[PDB]
């Protein structure tokens, strides 16, 4: 993955270059390694020493800049998207006078040493190209045991108030914010929360989802409660329902009108995963898996190695047999009085996790992995 650190000043600043500065404001408490690499680059290329005015975060640095409390800040590009949450116009307020590119080696997929593996499915709340940065509102762990032919779907509510890994600095915030930092943040957050290894991920957005359902010829689910979606455009009666792509996206997004709200929305997402798996495990879809890869690779990100896809597909083509699927959801209590690490100035709704639910969820993941 590619990112950058820059020295930024106000758009109208008389400052044109780093040699005109004596200090820069930066969150060296939390991004020190990156910040020092920028400062060494500036020393190398411009023979300019800069002292650091420590800020509590990139957001705090940005606030000090616009307030005119500092002349210049360091900005790590990843955090631009975090700043944007409180300051949507931030890009228009600043100019960049020095830029350094950075590359982080992606954490490899982990091959399980047994019959079970965990795949994290992250669903990003935007239309458009897959590289579009947004929140991760779908966060479903799929625990698969090829020996017992069981799958467990664990849904963690988007609003779940948990320590956010990496860019989140392990501070508590809504899980969905982890998606802004990147898929590695979401993965590590859930690995930390459930105490399990996540072998692979799949990341997709609204546009990705539509393309996938189109390719599979829609999906078939059993709907448990009458509801409508997307400003009353779609109406879903009780019973068996065929969902084309737009219908399916409405089906997985609606929560307010459901009897159990977001928990029911979580259950509808789980129904749709099962329905997708049923399409993906048809003889034709398996035989044609390479065409599916070709058709969706520009819109769906995954680190499942090709080799592994081939093994999973071919084992299934040879053996047949359906996976029995069970589902569970992490429970808690909605609150509006807890601080968001990403958005400290805003009152947000979060779900404080129930301890006993966490224990149950963890135990069920372990059981399925071990074949209990
Ligand atoms: C068959 C094969 C390949 C192998 C053999 C099978 C085998 C042996 C194993 C199976 C495992 C493998 C390797 C492959 C199979 C493929 C898998 C595992 C899954 C496919 C399913 C998938 C990729 C996605 C389904 C995700 C889903 C239910 C929804 C995603 C929709 C999105 C992007 C967003 C919605 C966000 C929401 C709810 C609100 C935002 O909306 P908004 O922001 O407006 O609302 P607000 O925020 O305000 O609420
Ligand atoms: Mn959303």
GROMACS .gro file of C-alpha atoms in nm, residues 28-367:
model
  340
   28UNK     CA    1   0.491   1.238   1.720
   29UNK     CA    2   0.319   1.060   2.011
   30UNK     CA    3   0.137   0.831   1.768
   31UNK     CA    4   0.298   0.848   1.420
   32UNK     CA    5   0.659   0.901   1.518
   33UNK     CA    6   0.828   0.652   1.287
   34UNK     CA    7   0.667   0.804   0.976
   35UNK     CA    8   0.722   1.162   1.096
   36UNK     CA    9   1.095   1.105   1.162
   37UNK     CA   10   1.141   0.954   0.815
   38UNK     CA   11   0.993   1.273   0.662
   39UNK     CA   12   1.216   1.496   0.877
   40UNK     CA   13   1.526   1.299   0.774
   41UNK     CA   14   1.426   1.331   0.407
   42UNK     CA   15   1.393   1.711   0.450
   43UNK     CA   16   1.732   1.721   0.623
   44UNK     CA   17   1.880   1.513   0.341
   45UNK     CA   18   1.734   1.701   0.044
   46UNK     CA   19   1.713   2.057   0.181
   47UNK     CA   20   1.962   2.066   0.463
   48UNK     CA   21   1.688   2.208   0.688
   49UNK     CA   22   1.645   2.115   1.055
   50UNK     CA   23   1.290   2.136   1.181
   51UNK     CA   24   1.184   2.117   1.542
   52UNK     CA   25   0.855   1.945   1.620
   53UNK     CA   26   0.563   2.103   1.803
   54UNK     CA   27   0.385   1.791   1.931
   55UNK     CA   28   0.012   1.767   1.850
   56UNK     CA   29  -0.224   1.510   2.006
   57UNK     CA   30  -0.337   1.386   1.660
   58UNK     CA   31  -0.343   1.477   1.290
   59UNK     CA   32  -0.689   1.624   1.352
   60UNK     CA   33  -0.548   1.840   1.635
   61UNK     CA   34  -0.261   1.952   1.407
   62UNK     CA   35  -0.514   2.047   1.140
   63UNK     CA   36  -0.720   2.244   1.396
   64UNK     CA   37  -0.410   2.437   1.507
   65UNK     CA   38  -0.326   2.520   1.146
   66UNK     CA   39  -0.667   2.663   1.059
   67UNK     CA   40  -0.677   2.850   1.394
   68UNK     CA   41  -0.343   3.010   1.299
   69UNK     CA   42  -0.176   2.863   1.609
   70UNK     CA   43   0.093   2.700   1.394
   71UNK     CA   44   0.234   2.794   1.053
   72UNK     CA   45   0.286   2.436   0.925
   73UNK     CA   46   0.188   2.073   0.996
   74UNK     CA   47   0.290   1.727   0.891
   75UNK     CA   48   0.003   1.539   0.724
   76UNK     CA   49  -0.002   1.164   0.672
   77UNK     CA   50  -0.238   1.107   0.376
   78UNK     CA   51  -0.421   0.819   0.549
   79UNK     CA   52  -0.550   1.064   0.807
   80UNK     CA   53  -0.688   1.309   0.548
   81UNK     CA   54  -0.995   1.086   0.535
   82UNK     CA   55  -1.028   1.103   0.917
   83UNK     CA   56  -0.997   1.483   0.923
   84UNK     CA   57  -1.264   1.489   0.648
   85UNK     CA   58  -1.517   1.345   0.898
   86UNK     CA   59  -1.518   1.669   1.103
   87UNK     CA   60  -1.387   1.903   0.833
   88UNK     CA   61  -1.524   1.801   0.493
   89UNK     CA   62  -1.366   2.100   0.319
   90UNK     CA   63  -1.013   2.041   0.462
   91UNK     CA   64  -0.856   1.989   0.117
   92UNK     CA   65  -0.956   2.338   0.003
   93UNK     CA   66  -0.806   2.499   0.317
   94UNK     CA   67  -0.445   2.381   0.266
   95UNK     CA   68  -0.156   2.353   0.023
   96UNK     CA   69   0.133   2.108   0.038
   97UNK     CA   70   0.490   2.238   0.010
   98UNK     CA   71   0.691   1.916   0.054
   99UNK     CA   72   0.590   1.555  -0.020
  100UNK     CA   73   0.747   1.218   0.068
  101UNK     CA   74   0.613   0.884  -0.062
  102UNK     CA   75   0.592   0.575   0.156
  103UNK     CA   76   0.515   0.208   0.089
  104UNK     CA   77   0.404  -0.049   0.347
  105UNK     CA   78   0.442  -0.419   0.264
  106UNK     CA   79   0.100  -0.584   0.286
  107UNK     CA   80   0.054  -0.838   0.566
  108UNK     CA   81   0.043  -1.169   0.386
  109UNK     CA   82  -0.258  -1.399   0.399
  110UNK     CA   83  -0.212  -1.664   0.668
  111UNK     CA   84  -0.244  -2.029   0.564
  112UNK     CA   85  -0.420  -2.219   0.840
  113UNK     CA   86  -0.234  -2.519   0.983
  114UNK     CA   87  -0.566  -2.708   0.992
  115UNK     CA   88  -0.906  -2.784   0.838
  116UNK     CA   89  -1.046  -2.442   0.938
  117UNK     CA   90  -0.989  -2.083   0.832
  118UNK     CA   91  -1.140  -1.741   0.889
  119UNK     CA   92  -1.233  -1.496   0.611
  120UNK     CA   93  -1.328  -1.137   0.700
  121UNK     CA   94  -1.584  -0.971   0.470
  122UNK     CA   95  -1.572  -0.590   0.476
  123UNK     CA   96  -1.851  -0.398   0.299
  124UNK     CA   97  -1.774  -0.034   0.228
  125UNK     CA   98  -2.060   0.218   0.221
  126UNK     CA   99  -2.005   0.381  -0.116
  127UNK     CA  100  -2.071   0.345  -0.486
  128UNK     CA  101  -1.789   0.379  -0.741
  129UNK     CA  102  -1.438   0.233  -0.789
  130UNK     CA  103  -1.323  -0.012  -0.520
  131UNK     CA  104  -1.028   0.206  -0.412
  132UNK     CA  105  -1.284   0.470  -0.290
  133UNK     CA  106  -1.217   0.520   0.087
  134UNK     CA  107  -1.518   0.497   0.318
  135UNK     CA  108  -1.649   0.338   0.638
  136UNK     CA  109  -1.679  -0.040   0.668
  137UNK     CA  110  -2.050  -0.093   0.753
  138UNK     CA  111  -2.049  -0.469   0.691
  139UNK     CA  112  -1.803  -0.662   0.909
  140UNK     CA  113  -1.871  -1.031   0.891
  141UNK     CA  114  -1.626  -1.304   0.994
  142UNK     CA  115  -1.677  -1.638   0.816
  143UNK     CA  116  -1.529  -1.930   1.008
  144UNK     CA  117  -1.511  -2.227   0.768
  145UNK     CA  118  -1.431  -2.585   0.870
  146UNK     CA  119  -1.374  -2.797   0.558
  147UNK     CA  120  -1.363  -3.121   0.767
  148UNK     CA  121  -1.702  -3.083   0.939
  149UNK     CA  122  -1.850  -2.884   0.649
  150UNK     CA  123  -1.969  -2.609   0.884
  151UNK     CA  124  -1.959  -2.231   0.843
  152UNK     CA  125  -2.021  -1.981   1.122
  153UNK     CA  126  -2.108  -1.622   1.030
  154UNK     CA  127  -2.017  -1.376   1.306
  155UNK     CA  128  -2.149  -1.026   1.254
  156UNK     CA  129  -2.004  -0.737   1.452
  157UNK     CA  130  -2.230  -0.426   1.445
  158UNK     CA  131  -2.093  -0.131   1.253
  159UNK     CA  132  -2.138   0.084   1.563
  160UNK     CA  133  -1.961  -0.164   1.798
  161UNK     CA  134  -1.739   0.041   2.032
  162UNK     CA  135  -1.403  -0.137   2.026
  163UNK     CA  136  -1.027  -0.061   2.037
  164UNK     CA  137  -0.939   0.029   1.675
  165UNK     CA  138  -0.602  -0.109   1.566
  166UNK     CA  139  -0.317   0.060   1.377
  167UNK     CA  140  -0.427   0.414   1.272
  168UNK     CA  141  -0.694   0.400   1.546
  169UNK     CA  142  -0.409   0.383   1.798
  170UNK     CA  143  -0.598   0.110   1.991
  171UNK     CA  144  -0.843   0.370   2.124
  172UNK     CA  145  -1.215   0.289   2.142
  173UNK     CA  146  -1.431   0.402   1.849
  174UNK     CA  147  -1.707   0.261   1.630
  175UNK     CA  148  -1.582  -0.040   1.430
  176UNK     CA  149  -1.694   0.110   1.101
  177UNK     CA  150  -1.428   0.379   1.137
  178UNK     CA  151  -1.159   0.114   1.114
  179UNK     CA  152  -1.250   0.088   0.738
  180UNK     CA  153  -1.126   0.447   0.689
  181UNK     CA  154  -0.774   0.357   0.817
  182UNK     CA  155  -0.777   0.059   0.581
  183UNK     CA  156  -0.862  -0.308   0.568
  184UNK     CA  157  -0.555  -0.394   0.784
  185UNK     CA  158  -0.702  -0.177   1.065
  186UNK     CA  159  -1.041  -0.356   1.040
  187UNK     CA  160  -0.873  -0.701   1.035
  188UNK     CA  161  -0.644  -0.636   1.329
  189UNK     CA  162  -0.928  -0.476   1.527
  190UNK     CA  163  -1.134  -0.794   1.495
  191UNK     CA  164  -0.836  -1.024   1.551
  192UNK     CA  165  -0.774  -0.834   1.877
  193UNK     CA  166  -1.143  -0.834   1.976
  194UNK     CA  167  -1.208  -1.206   1.916
  195UNK     CA  168  -0.854  -1.335   1.983
  196UNK     CA  169  -0.842  -1.522   1.650
  197UNK     CA  170  -0.631  -1.513   1.338
  198UNK     CA  171  -0.800  -1.387   1.027
  199UNK     CA  172  -0.655  -1.578   0.732
  200UNK     CA  173  -0.801  -1.379   0.443
  201UNK     CA  174  -1.017  -1.077   0.368
  202UNK     CA  175  -1.262  -0.971   0.096
  203UNK     CA  176  -1.341  -0.599   0.061
  204UNK     CA  177  -1.622  -0.475  -0.165
  205UNK     CA  178  -1.843  -0.169  -0.196
  206UNK     CA  179  -2.204  -0.099  -0.321
  207UNK     CA  180  -2.098  -0.107  -0.687
  208UNK     CA  181  -1.898  -0.425  -0.628
  209UNK     CA  182  -2.199  -0.592  -0.463
  210UNK     CA  183  -2.436  -0.505  -0.754
  211UNK     CA  184  -2.189  -0.641  -1.013
  212UNK     CA  185  -2.150  -0.963  -0.818
  213UNK     CA  186  -2.526  -1.024  -0.774
  214UNK     CA  187  -2.580  -0.944  -1.149
  215UNK     CA  188  -2.315  -1.200  -1.246
  216UNK     CA  189  -2.472  -1.472  -1.025
  217UNK     CA  190  -2.823  -1.422  -1.165
  218UNK     CA  191  -2.960  -1.270  -0.843
  219UNK     CA  192  -3.007  -1.447  -0.509
  220UNK     CA  193  -3.290  -1.630  -0.332
  221UNK     CA  194  -3.363  -1.584   0.037
  222UNK     CA  195  -3.645  -1.655   0.282
  223UNK     CA  196  -3.768  -1.328   0.422
  224UNK     CA  197  -3.896  -1.339   0.784
  225UNK     CA  198  -4.074  -1.002   0.806
  226UNK     CA  199  -4.255  -0.769   0.569
  227UNK     CA  200  -4.052  -0.456   0.502
  228UNK     CA  201  -3.970  -0.200   0.236
  229UNK     CA  202  -3.640  -0.043   0.134
  230UNK     CA  203  -3.491   0.256  -0.051
  231UNK     CA  204  -3.758   0.518  -0.002
  232UNK     CA  205  -4.035   0.262  -0.051
  233UNK     CA  206  -3.908   0.146  -0.391
  234UNK     CA  207  -3.887  -0.221  -0.293
  235UNK     CA  208  -4.137  -0.417  -0.090
  236UNK     CA  209  -4.037  -0.751   0.054
  237UNK     CA  210  -4.320  -0.981   0.161
  238UNK     CA  211  -4.283  -1.270   0.405
  239UNK     CA  212  -4.172  -1.592   0.230
  240UNK     CA  213  -3.935  -1.690  -0.051
  241UNK     CA  214  -3.807  -1.385  -0.242
  242UNK     CA  215  -3.581  -1.359  -0.547
  243UNK     CA  216  -3.353  -1.056  -0.526
  244UNK     CA  217  -3.198  -0.895  -0.831
  245UNK     CA  218  -2.896  -0.675  -0.762
  246UNK     CA  219  -3.072  -0.345  -0.673
  247UNK     CA  220  -3.332  -0.533  -0.460
  248UNK     CA  221  -3.054  -0.721  -0.281
  249UNK     CA  222  -2.869  -0.400  -0.199
  250UNK     CA  223  -3.193  -0.250  -0.056
  251UNK     CA  224  -3.250  -0.576   0.132
  252UNK     CA  225  -2.909  -0.552   0.306
  253UNK     CA  226  -2.915  -0.177   0.385
  254UNK     CA  227  -3.253  -0.122   0.555
  255UNK     CA  228  -3.259  -0.120   0.936
  256UNK     CA  229  -3.487   0.145   1.088
  257UNK     CA  230  -3.819  -0.018   0.997
  258UNK     CA  231  -3.715  -0.370   1.110
  259UNK     CA  232  -3.851  -0.522   1.434
  260UNK     CA  233  -3.496  -0.575   1.572
  261UNK     CA  234  -3.341  -0.286   1.375
  262UNK     CA  235  -2.969  -0.328   1.300
  263UNK     CA  236  -2.968  -0.684   1.440
  264UNK     CA  237  -3.230  -0.781   1.180
  265UNK     CA  238  -3.025  -0.599   0.914
  266UNK     CA  239  -2.728  -0.810   1.026
  267UNK     CA  240  -2.942  -1.124   0.986
  268UNK     CA  241  -3.051  -1.017   0.634
  269UNK     CA  242  -2.685  -0.968   0.538
  270UNK     CA  243  -2.618  -1.322   0.669
  271UNK     CA  244  -2.908  -1.457   0.459
  272UNK     CA  245  -2.757  -1.291   0.153
  273UNK     CA  246  -2.409  -1.443   0.220
  274UNK     CA  247  -2.568  -1.788   0.236
  275UNK     CA  248  -2.757  -1.715  -0.086
  276UNK     CA  249  -2.435  -1.596  -0.257
  277UNK     CA  250  -2.251  -1.909  -0.140
  278UNK     CA  251  -2.527  -2.125  -0.287
  279UNK     CA  252  -2.481  -1.953  -0.627
  280UNK     CA  253  -2.100  -1.972  -0.602
  281UNK     CA  254  -2.106  -2.345  -0.528
  282UNK     CA  255  -2.323  -2.444  -0.827
  283UNK     CA  256  -2.145  -2.677  -1.070
  284UNK     CA  257  -2.146  -2.407  -1.341
  285UNK     CA  258  -2.010  -2.132  -1.111
  286UNK     CA  259  -1.735  -2.362  -0.988
  287UNK     CA  260  -1.637  -2.480  -1.338
  288UNK     CA  261  -1.633  -2.116  -1.442
  289UNK     CA  262  -1.459  -1.971  -1.137
  290UNK     CA  263  -1.184  -1.813  -1.357
  291UNK     CA  264  -1.450  -1.615  -1.547
  292UNK     CA  265  -1.597  -1.500  -1.214
  293UNK     CA  266  -1.248  -1.385  -1.103
  294UNK     CA  267  -1.196  -1.208  -1.438
  295UNK     CA  268  -1.539  -1.040  -1.417
  296UNK     CA  269  -1.510  -0.912  -1.058
  297UNK     CA  270  -1.133  -0.864  -0.997
  298UNK     CA  271  -1.143  -0.492  -1.078
  299UNK     CA  272  -1.417  -0.426  -0.821
  300UNK     CA  273  -1.354  -0.675  -0.537
  301UNK     CA  274  -1.030  -0.677  -0.335
  302UNK     CA  275  -0.907  -0.998  -0.168
  303UNK     CA  276  -0.583  -1.154  -0.051
  304UNK     CA  277  -0.703  -1.511  -0.098
  305UNK     CA  278  -0.416  -1.652  -0.309
  306UNK     CA  279  -0.511  -1.785  -0.654
  307UNK     CA  280  -0.365  -2.119  -0.546
  308UNK     CA  281  -0.609  -2.133  -0.254
  309UNK     CA  282  -0.908  -2.037  -0.472
  310UNK     CA  283  -0.817  -2.324  -0.707
  311UNK     CA  284  -0.792  -2.570  -0.418
  312UNK     CA  285  -1.125  -2.461  -0.264
  313UNK     CA  286  -1.307  -2.468  -0.598
  314UNK     CA  287  -1.172  -2.802  -0.715
  315UNK     CA  288  -1.219  -2.980  -0.382
  316UNK     CA  289  -1.582  -2.864  -0.389
  317UNK     CA  290  -1.630  -2.966  -0.757
  318UNK     CA  291  -1.504  -3.313  -0.671
  319UNK     CA  292  -1.679  -3.370  -0.337
  320UNK     CA  293  -1.999  -3.165  -0.363
  321UNK     CA  294  -2.201  -3.137  -0.041
  322UNK     CA  295  -2.347  -2.827   0.124
  323UNK     CA  296  -2.201  -2.642   0.425
  324UNK     CA  297  -2.434  -2.612   0.722
  325UNK     CA  298  -2.434  -2.242   0.815
  326UNK     CA  299  -2.496  -2.092   1.156
  327UNK     CA  300  -2.500  -1.725   1.250
  328UNK     CA  301  -2.434  -1.515   1.556
  329UNK     CA  302  -2.402  -1.142   1.638
  330UNK     CA  303  -2.211  -0.950   1.901
  331UNK     CA  304  -2.458  -0.778   2.131
  332UNK     CA  305  -2.442  -0.459   2.338
  333UNK     CA  306  -2.612  -0.137   2.443
  334UNK     CA  307  -2.651   0.176   2.232
  335UNK     CA  308  -2.518   0.494   2.389
  336UNK     CA  309  -2.456   0.851   2.280
  337UNK     CA  310  -2.233   0.969   2.565
  338UNK     CA  311  -1.905   0.789   2.476
  339UNK     CA  312  -1.617   0.959   2.295
  340UNK     CA  313  -1.527   0.878   1.935
  341UNK     CA  314  -1.151   0.870   1.883
  342UNK     CA  315  -1.184   0.975   1.517
  343UNK     CA  316  -1.447   1.243   1.583
  344UNK     CA  317  -1.381   1.380   1.933
  345UNK     CA  318  -1.599   1.688   1.880
  346UNK     CA  319  -1.913   1.499   1.773
  347UNK     CA  320  -2.171   1.306   1.981
  348UNK     CA  321  -2.207   0.974   1.794
  349UNK     CA  322  -2.421   0.669   1.860
  350UNK     CA  323  -2.201   0.370   1.960
  351UNK     CA  324  -2.279   0.020   2.085
  352UNK     CA  325  -2.106  -0.062   2.412
  353UNK     CA  326  -2.020  -0.435   2.399
  354UNK     CA  327  -2.184  -0.683   2.633
  355UNK     CA  328  -1.911  -0.887   2.807
  356UNK     CA  329  -2.113  -1.207   2.823
  357UNK     CA  330  -2.201  -1.181   2.452
  358UNK     CA  331  -1.829  -1.143   2.371
  359UNK     CA  332  -1.754  -1.462   2.568
  360UNK     CA  333  -2.027  -1.656   2.384
  361UNK     CA  334  -1.918  -1.529   2.042
  362UNK     CA  335  -1.554  -1.621   2.107
  363UNK     CA  336  -1.647  -1.968   2.232
  364UNK     CA  337  -1.860  -2.037   1.920
  365UNK     CA  338  -1.576  -1.936   1.683
  366UNK     CA  339  -1.334  -2.168   1.870
  367UNK     CA  340  -1.587  -2.454   1.865
   0.00000   0.00000   0.00000
